[PDB]
Amino acid sequence: VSRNDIGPSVVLDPTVKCPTLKQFNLSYNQLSFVPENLTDVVEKLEQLILEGNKISGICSPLRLKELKILNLSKNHISSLSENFLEACPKVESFSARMNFLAAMPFLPPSMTILKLSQNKFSCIPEAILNLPHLRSLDMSSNDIQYLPGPAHWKSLNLRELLFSHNQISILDLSEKAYLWSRVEKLHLSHNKLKEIPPEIGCLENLTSLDVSYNLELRSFPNEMGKLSKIWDLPLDELHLNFDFKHIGCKAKDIIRFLQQRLKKAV
What we know:
- This is Leucine-rich repeat serine/threonine-protein kinase 2.
- It is found in: Cytoplasmic vesicle; Perikaryon; Golgi apparatus membrane; Cell projection, Axon.
- By secondary structure, the protein is low in regular secondary structure.
- About 5% of the residues lie in helices and about 10% in strands.
- The protein has 1 helix and 9 strands.
- It is elongated.
């Protein structure tokens, strides 16, 4: 039930027990609340989608023991409850795009993919750095001052980190950067980066790296040539010091060139 003009709140009768409902879409309606009595009615729900509705704010804790994909993107949520996701120990993909969020409360450890781009995040919340299995993370278009180094993060399967359009100053990779070895994508476009760390060669499994639109950046480090798996490296609006106009725009050629620079340079 999507894109209809349903509102302001959907309340269900407790005498209706629907244990066979395993998807529930309510996006783009005129909802102004999470549907009441969602626990005892839809007892085993997999993927709840309340995108696009005009939700004022969460007050009651979910109780869905079987939730797997929660979605609250494009809403007017500003403050999230400290406990509204503690009774959902199977949540995997949580999305809260286009909101007014400021702080992320305690999340179940089974959360793997988490996408919270465009809200009002001033710094990475302490409750997101401690997820044991955090595969993907997207915090683009926030205002992140400094993301912590790899030693502070606890997850090991980190395989995507999106932080474009953020006021990040200095990428820290000195301390135990071998943790991030499995990172398969990393974006830092439109940031205040001054210099790419030389230890970037340790993140040997990168396939895409977007460091474009960083005017303060001048030149790539040599050791970057060891990232033989890269196939996408946009350089749009990047006044690079070392000349690569003769190379052109191919990424693998750039990486091979830097690789040759490693062995001997004159």
